[PDB]
């Protein structure tokens, strides 16, 4: 059945829609759907592209209001990386507080974390209920279901500056130093290679966490 506007979407709104590379792109929406219990969402990028996109895999342009997230929350934020960005998902793992110094912890669908501010976030149109549900790498959607359901018990691991630990990296624990600690975050220095990683303190990948999971 077709639809010219469902709740808060109307036909012609702008709007970011996710891309088969997993990035998240702005477009139009150009037409709407709902085939017994299932709404869809048709986006033509700017690119002239298009793709027919469920509601989860849509999100708002425009950043979030003051107090409009909450932990759990399923976002779209900015991941920075040298003079690139990318628009990825992710859940909303902290809001703004004095501890964080203000900003939103994300953990993103791959599993990396990071601080970001409200012009670096999206709200996805219509997560799922249980917003986890449609993180496609299960190991994480089993990380966030977790996260979610015990927050704020949170287990983390107290690590100072200079102290040395073991970090997991794609299936080898490797010589490590903690650089800096930024919230519920930590910086670790690989020793080998001197490549470094911005990793949740609760983080199995780090040794003490990990023998105490
Ligand atoms: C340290 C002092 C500097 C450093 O290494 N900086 C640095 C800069 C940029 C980095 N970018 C990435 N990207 C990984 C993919 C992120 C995808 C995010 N999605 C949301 C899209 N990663 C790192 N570091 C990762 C850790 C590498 C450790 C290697 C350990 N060896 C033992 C193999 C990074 C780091």
């Given at each position: 059945?077709?639809?010219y506007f469902?709740?808060?979407?109307?036909?012609?709104?702008?709007?970011?829609?996710?891309?088969?590379?997993?990035?998240?792109?702005?477009?139009?929406?150009?037409?709407?759907?709902?085939?017994?219990?299932?709404?869809?969402?048709k986006?033509?990028?700017?690119?002239?592209?298009?793709?027919?996109?469920s509601?989860?895999?849509?999100?708002?342009?425009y950043h979030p209001?003051?107090?409009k997230?909450?932990?759990?929350?399923?976002?779209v934020?900015?991941?920075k990386?040298?003079?690139?960005?990318?628009l990825?998902?992710?859940?909303?793992?902290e809001?703004?507080?004095?501890?964080?110094?203000?900003?939103?912890?994300?953990?993103f669908?791959?599993g990396?974390?990071s601080?970001?501010?409200?012009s670096?976030?999206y709200p996805?149109?219509?997560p799922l209920?249980?917003?986890?549900?449609?993180?496609?790498?299960?190991?994480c959607?089993?990380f966030?279901?977790?996260?979610?359901?015990?927050?704020?018990?949170?287990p983390?691991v107290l690590?100072?500056?200079?102290?040395?630990i073991?970090?997991?990296?794609?299936?080898?624990?490797?010589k490590?130093?903690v650089?800096?600690?930024?919230?519920?975050?930590?910086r670790?220095?690989?020793?080998?290679?001197?490549?470094?990683?911005?990793?949740?303190?609760?983080?199995?990948?780090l040794?003490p966490?990990?023998?105490?999971?």
């Amino acid at each position: 059945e077709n639809l010219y506007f469902q709740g808060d979407l109307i036909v012609s709104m702008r709007i970011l829609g996710k891309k088969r590379t997993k990035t998240w792109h702005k477009g139009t929406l150009i037409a709407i759907q709902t085939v017994g219990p299932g709404k869809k969402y048709k986006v033509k990028f700017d690119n002239k592209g298009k793709s027919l996109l469920s509601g989860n895999h849509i999100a708002y342009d425009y950043h979030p209001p003051a107090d409009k997230l909450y932990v759990g929350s399923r976002v779209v934020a900015k991941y920075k990386d040298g003079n690139q960005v990318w628009l990825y998902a992710g859940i909303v793992a902290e809001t703004p507080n004095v501890k964080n110094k203000l900003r939103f912890l994300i953990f993103f669908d791959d599993g990396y974390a990071s601080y970001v501010t409200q012009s670096e976030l999206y709200p996805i149109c219509r997560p799922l209920k249980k917003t986890w549900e449609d993180i496609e790498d299960i190991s994480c959607r089993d990380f966030i279901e977790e996260y979610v359901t015990a927050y704020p018990n949170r287990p983390m691991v107290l690590l100072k500056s200079g102290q040395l630990i073991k970090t997991e990296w794609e299936g080898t624990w490797w010589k490590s130093r903690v650089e800096e600690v930024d919230g519920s975050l930590v910086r670790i220095l690989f020793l080998d290679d001197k490549r470094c990683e911005w990793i949740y303190r609760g983080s199995t990948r780090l040794e003490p966490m990990f023998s105490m999971k």
